[PDB]
Design a protein around this ligand. Structure first.
Ligand code: NI
Length: 186
């Protein structure tokens, strides 16, 4: 049975059950992430912000099947247009709101990448993306509220590509953790 996670620790327990095998039931994982009611006291340890850009804060290594992490987005902080390295990517809002802009994969001719659609992801909602769906940018467009999001990627990955919106040209980027298990990792 998929039960409602009572706490963040309970969610992580349930996730380890859902990833016990070699495949991923995307809709079940999204439903369980959405069902956890964000409780700031439970994730404050991981909500380590930087003034200048968003931070990635590892929470759980998923016994190697997945990385679960909390991203902290100051007012105005956003990401590149990026892919997700042939992995499943779930994004649940813990606090605030994020704007997600969807892009198709660029063709070979340098051209402006035009958005295909956009939406506003709200507290407690869980979105899903993978490379077959397309590329996205995620942005905290708020001038007054930090956003905090919980991301699960399976398999784990620590490199991806950023895309130049003006040309579609991509570059490989190595992502780093701001903290791991509540510990700042400079
Ligand atoms: Ni993403």
């Amino acid at each position: 049975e998929l039960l409602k996670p009572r706490t963040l620790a309970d969610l992580i327990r349930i996730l380890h059950e859902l990833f016990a095998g070699d495949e991923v039931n995307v809709e079940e994982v999204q439903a369980v992430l959405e069902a956890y009611e964000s409780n700031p006291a439970e994730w404050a340890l991981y909500a380590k912000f930087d003034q200048y850009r968003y931070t990635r804060n590892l929470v759980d290594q998923g016994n190697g099947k997945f990385n679960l992490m909390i991203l902290c987005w100051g007012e105005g902080h956003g990401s590149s247009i990026h892919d997700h390295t042939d992995s499943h990517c779930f994004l649940k809002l813990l606090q605030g709101n994020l704007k997600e802009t969807l892009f198709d994969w660029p063709d070979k001719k340098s051209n402006e990448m035009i958005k295909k659609s956009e939406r506003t992801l709200r507290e407690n909602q869980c979105a899903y993306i993978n490379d077959s769906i397309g590329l996205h940018r995620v942005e905290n467009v708020s001038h007054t509220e930090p956003a905090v999001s919980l991301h699960l990627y399976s398999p784990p990955f620590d490199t991806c590509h950023a895309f130049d919106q003006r040309t579609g040209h991509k570059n490989k980027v190595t992502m780093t953790f701001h903290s791991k298990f509540g510990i700042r990792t400079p």
